[PDB]
Amino acid sequence: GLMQFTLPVRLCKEIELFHFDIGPFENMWPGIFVYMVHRSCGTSCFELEKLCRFIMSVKKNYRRVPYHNWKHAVTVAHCMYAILQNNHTLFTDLERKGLLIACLCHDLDHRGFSNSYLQKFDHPLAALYSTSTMEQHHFSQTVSILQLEGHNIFSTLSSSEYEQVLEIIRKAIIATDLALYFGNRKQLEEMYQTGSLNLNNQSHRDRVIGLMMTACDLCSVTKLWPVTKLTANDIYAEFWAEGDEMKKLGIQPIPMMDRDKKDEVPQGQLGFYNAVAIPCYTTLTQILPPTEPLLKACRDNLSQWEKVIRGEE
Numbered sequence: 001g002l003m004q005f006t007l008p009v010r011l012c013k014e015i016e017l018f019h020f021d022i023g024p025f026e027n028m029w030p031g032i033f034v035y036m037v038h039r040s041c042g043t044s045c046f047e048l049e050k051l052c053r054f055i056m057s058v059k060k061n062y063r064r065v066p067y068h069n070w071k072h073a074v075t076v077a078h079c080m081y082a083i084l085q086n087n088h089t090l091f092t093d094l095e096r097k098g099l100l101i102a103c104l105c106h107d108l109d110h111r112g113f114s115n116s117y118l119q120k121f122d123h124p125l126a127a128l129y130s131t132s133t134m135e136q137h138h139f140s141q142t143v144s145i146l147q148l149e150g151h152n153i154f155s156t157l158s159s160s161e162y163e164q165v166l167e168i169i170r171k172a173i174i175a176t177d178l179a180l181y182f183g184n185r186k187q188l189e190e191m192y193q194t195g196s197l198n199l200n201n202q203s204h205r206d207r208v209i210g211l212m213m214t215a216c217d218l219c220s221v222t223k224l225w226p227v228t229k230l231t232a233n234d235i236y237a238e239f240w241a242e243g244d245e246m247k248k249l250g251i252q253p254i255p256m257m258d259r260d261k262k263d264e265v266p267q268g269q270l271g272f273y274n275a276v277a278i279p280c281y282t283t284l285t286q287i288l289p290p291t292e293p294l295l296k297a298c299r300d301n302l303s304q305w306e307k308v309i310r311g312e313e
């Protein structure tokens with residue numbers, strides 16, 4: 001129990017900041033995650049032997065896709081870490097445990113295709129789960145891994161604590177379905193403004209955890225410009241493949257997915273920042289003020305995309 005993960009000095013310092021990039025050395029990402037669990041949660045939260053076996057099984061069940069891959073999983077978990085570390089007293093013991101695990105598992109077994117494509121293809125997952133198709137799959141895969149011999153990192157919780165943490169994880173993973181974020185954020189906006197927001201109301205905390213999940217999930221737009229811009233290529237490599245697969249079902253895809261309309265990307269990023277990212281981080285910052293560096297970094301990246309359109313890069 002006296003075995004800490006320690007990082008080199010640069011990483012030990014930058015890991016605390018919202019804009020930390022986990023680096024290109026895949027072999028360091030498990031250690032980076034255990035480091036975050038230890039500081040967020042404690043060295044006691046999980047049996048190290050069980051946690052390492054859980055992490056490696058989660059890693060194996062992420063595929064080799066350009067964006068929805070193991071690096072995304074760890075990156076999203078790091079944003080959650082930075083949120084929890086800057087909001088120390090707002091969250092329960094169980095919540096800290098549940099949310100880092102939910103972020104690590106939230107895109108398990110992703111194939112690089114949207115819920116929409118699965119439904120037009122008539123994928124069996126679309127018959128099994130008619131809404132939030134991939135997200136109910138990601139939660140399914142999380143439960144499957146937790147039930148492997150040796151992989152139950154929660155085994156030392158009481159029965160009722162075990163049911164509560166799995167319910168935190170299920171709601172957190174379902175909330176990463178962006179179709180649900182629009183109405184979740186509108187409701188949090190009304191509640192914060194009329195002043196009815198109450199973090200002791202469970203249904204309210206649920207909504208706030210959902211928004212934290214959207215914020216961590218989108219956190220590649222809150223990095224320094226060179227990171228955000230190089231990540232945007234990874235996300236468009238998936239979108240353009242999905243577009244090709246739409247054309248193979250005889251369906252003109254949306255322009256966001258059409259590789260023949262690469263010129264329209266800068267304007268599509270503006271729409272995404274203005275309709276999704278900026279409002280997400282604004283409402284998050286209103287509810288949890290120390291998350292403001294995410295909103296500041298998002299606004300800087302919006303201004304960089306505006307510079308791309310004005311031909312200045």
Ligand SMILES: O=C(O)c1nc(C2CC2)cnc1Nc1cncnc1
Binds near residue numbers: 229235272
């Ligand atoms: O551009 C987008 O439409 C986009 N959409 C989603 C969500 C649908 C999966 C995530 N991120 C996105 N943009 C993005 C930019 N730069 C870096 N990482 C993501």
Ligand SMILES: [Mg+2]
Binds near residue numbers: 106107134176177
């Ligand atoms: Mg997802």
Ligand SMILES: [Zn+2]
Binds near residue numbers: 072076106107176
């Ligand atoms: Zn994701």
